[PDB]
């Protein structure tokens, strides 16, 4: 149960580091894979959940393999094809390949679907899916923070707004950080609600007892940690152009 959770030191010494990739470079490689997954996922008309599942597949895949060996641009499409099958929104192989091609090469034009080249990239995708399955040890059922967000928001009787912002925090927490490799989904969900409250100038009333709200969601959570993680998430959010704009109250 602690197989896919890592210490910061484990995160520092990743397979990619061991092949001369800077911390920051690797983080960038991850954000780009998530961006590609989101673009493809939107075009294929799968749900955010499916895109998210594919993103976790990717995140975990790169704790075992190196980016120097497996490019985000190759792994992302296969991860998404797989996540779409697993999440019950199956997309056809040719379909994911066609969309992958337009996302990566907007100006090229699809090869003859009869060519030896195209036949080879279809076979490369199938091969990469098998490699992913084997790297993850066929552990494919993923829990996301969003599940816990829905539950918890109600458990503070939050505005619709606040709830919308919390899910947004969760999705961006998938794109921008490695929280999913370090903290359980319920913890992350607490982090997201916390940042959403601070961002909306919302205050959750101290419980009748004197127990904080998050204590009803996960017992391991402390204010120190919440403040640390929200500050981290907020910092990367500030570095992402237009991202905060989407939740910025413009009035």
């Amino acid at each position: 149960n602690k197989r896919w959770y890592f210490t910061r030191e484990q995160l520092e010494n990743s397979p990619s580091r061991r092949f001369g990739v800077d911390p920051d470079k690797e983080l960038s490689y991850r954000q780009q894979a998530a961006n590609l997954l989101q673009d493809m996922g939107q075009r294929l008309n799968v749900s955010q959940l499916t895109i998210n599942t594919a993103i976790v597949y990717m995140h975990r895949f790169y704790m075992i393999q190196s980016f120097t060996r497996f490019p985000g641009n190759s792994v992302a499409p296969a991860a998404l094809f797989l996540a779409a099958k697993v999440e019950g929104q199956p997309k056809k192989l040719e379909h994911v390949i066609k969309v992958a091609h337009t996302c990566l090469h907007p100006q090229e034009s699809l090869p003859d679907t009869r060519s030896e080249a195209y036949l080879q990239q279809v076979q490369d995708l199938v091969i990469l899916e098998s490699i992913i399955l084997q790297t993850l040890g066929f552990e494919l059922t993923i829990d996301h923070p969003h599940t816990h967000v829905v539950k918890c928001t109600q458990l503070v009787r939050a505005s619709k707004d606040l709830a919308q912002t919390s899910y947004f925090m969760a999705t961006n927490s998938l794109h921008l950080t490695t929280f999913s490799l370090q903290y359980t989904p319920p913890v992350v969900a607490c982090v997201c609600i916390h940042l959403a409250c601070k961002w909306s100038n919302w205050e959750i009333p101290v419980s009748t007892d004197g127990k904080h709200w998050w204590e009803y969601v996960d017992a391991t959570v402390t204010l120190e940690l919440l403040d640390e993680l929200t500050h981290e998430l907020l910092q990367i959010l500030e570095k992402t152009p237009n991202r905060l704009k989407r939740i910025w109250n413009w009035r």
Binding site: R3, L82, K85, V86, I131, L133, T135, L136, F138, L140
Partner: protein, 307 residues
């Protein structure tokens, strides 16, 4: 060569014999531990890894229970894939057919109790097995019953918000297939599994599938000659089906009567009657069935180890 911490090569196991859909018995090369290897068939599969296998795996990984077959791990080959299960020596079909095998009422009580307990477990977890038959009931060397072969199982849901479920209808072997399915029902639940259990209980005495049909229509006629005829009186709303009379049914409950010969005990017969109930909603469920006086009588359930 690529890193692969979490998918061991099947070479750790030594193939002994096709016991099965390719099923091999095998032996861990270091411990002697016996396992079953089920290879994933890729006959064509023009869509990468088979979604049905993904499904079965997700379900086997979910279901961990004494009376459910146990997926140990998944192995690669270096390309193929094998599902590795805890090995089980016997299977009910092989035992019900081998005349050199004899059950006392007490051990039969024990078998049915483990079986209904397995069903209760999978249903509590929102899974339908959808392939109830004697050959999918395994028994280990130490007399523990396990449900196997979830390649046809499926998750289900609380189908409210006024949108009935649209599950696949051509599911579960014909001889064990419940009435609901034969009328084209797509909003069915756990009762379909309970019905097959009925057929198997009777099979513990008849030593043979009580109802063997040529085609689905033959199955329905045969079923009717045992359980009475369908009627909005017996099964309110039965009318609603498009294949009710449109299927040339016969207007016409000899169920307890036709089996008296094989199965001697009254409580056993009552339980079988409550399993083989026509209206699925009036059909006994796993919880009450476990509770039936049948498991709470003088010849109490006994281990099977002995035998």
């Amino acid at each position: 060569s690529v890193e692969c911490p979490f998918c061991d090569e099947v070479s750790k196991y030594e193939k002994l014999a096709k016991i099965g859909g390719e099923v091999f018995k095998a032996r861990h090369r270091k411990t002697g531990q016996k396992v079953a290897l089920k290879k994933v068939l890729m006959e064509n599969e023009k869509e990468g890894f088979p979604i049905t296998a993904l499904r079965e795996i997700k379900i086997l990984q979910l279901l961990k229970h004494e009376n459910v077959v146990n997926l140990i791990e998944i192995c690669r080959t270096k390309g193929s894939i094998y599902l590795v299960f805890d090995f089980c020596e016997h299977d009910l079909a092989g035992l019900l057919s081998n005349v050199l095998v004899k059950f006392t009422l007490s051990e039969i009580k024990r078998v049915m109790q483990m079986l209904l307990n397995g069903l209760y477990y999978i249903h509590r977890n929102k899974i339908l097995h959808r392939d109830m038959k004697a050959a999918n009931v395994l028994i280990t060397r130490d007399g523990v019953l396990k449900l196997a072969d979830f390649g046809l199982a499926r998750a289900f849901s609380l189908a409210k918000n006024s949108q009935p479920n649209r599950y696949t209808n051509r599911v579960v072997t014909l001889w064990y297939r419940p009435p609901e399915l034969l009328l084209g029902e797509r909003d069915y639940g756990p009762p379909i599994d309970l019905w097959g259990a009925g057929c198997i209980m009777a099979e513990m005495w008849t030593r043979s599938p009580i109802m063997q049909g040529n085609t689905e229509q033959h199955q329905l006629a045969l079923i009717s000659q045992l359980c009475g005829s369908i009627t909005p009186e017996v099964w309110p709303n039965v009318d609603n089906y498009e294949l009710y009379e449109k299927l040339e049914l016969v207007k016409g409950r000899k169920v307890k009567d036709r089996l008296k010969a094989y199965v001697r005990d009254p409580y056993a017969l009552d339980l079988i009657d409550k399993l083989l109930v026509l209206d699925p909603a009036q059909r006994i469920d796993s919880d009450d069935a476990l509770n039936h006086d049948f498991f709470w009588s003088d010849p109490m359930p006994s281990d099977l180890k002995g035998m």
